[PDB]
Write a protein that binds this ligand. Structure first.
Ligand code: 8C2
Length: 150
């Protein structure tokens, strides 16, 4: 009973979270997951400011109201070579990664590791935060409040 959560640097408080190395988060699970990090789904304005500070990924993830990919450098296999906050328009499917926004984070690039999941609740799952540099933090708990996500 284990969940891996791969996380990134924070840029103006915004970061990316991928669950179990696959697109596997529903919109309801995404909001609950950000709440476990004392965070919220970013607004489009919050995401645009993060992009301006150096944030980019090559993965679709929820923000408030849309599924997006922030892009700085054009790459043919990431958001069809677009730059800016690329918005997913047409998809059959509902599960993505998520972005999260922590208002208490530094204002610009914070590429220190994440060493806590401060607002997880009591539960039976071994949850492991995996940083890009491989460093890990694990704790037993739960974050999902909707049954259809478990
Ligand atoms: C700076 C830092 N490293 N690990 C932890 C925990 C913290 C405090 N802020 C984090 C920021 C991203 C969401 C979770 C909370």
């Amino acid at each position: 009973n284990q969940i891996d959560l791969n996380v990134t640097c924070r840029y103006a408080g915004v970061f990316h979270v991928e669950k179990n190395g696959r697109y596997s988060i529903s919109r309801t699970e995404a909001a609950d997951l950000c709440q476990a990090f004392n965070s919220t789904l970013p607004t489009m304005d919050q995401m645009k400011l993060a992009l301006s500070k150096g944030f980019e990924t090559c993965r679709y993830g929820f923000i408030e109201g849309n599924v997006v990919i922030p892009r700085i450098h054009p790459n043919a296999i990431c958001a069809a070579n677009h730059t800016g906050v690329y918005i997913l328009v047409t998809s059959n499917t509902s599960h993505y990664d998520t972005y999260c926004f922590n208002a208490s984070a530094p204002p610009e690039e914070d590429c220190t590791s994440v060493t806590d999941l401060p607002n997880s609740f009591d539960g039976p799952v071994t949850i492991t935060i995996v940083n890009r540099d491989g460093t890990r933090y694990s704790k037993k708990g739960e974050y999902r409040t909707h049954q259809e996500d478990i």
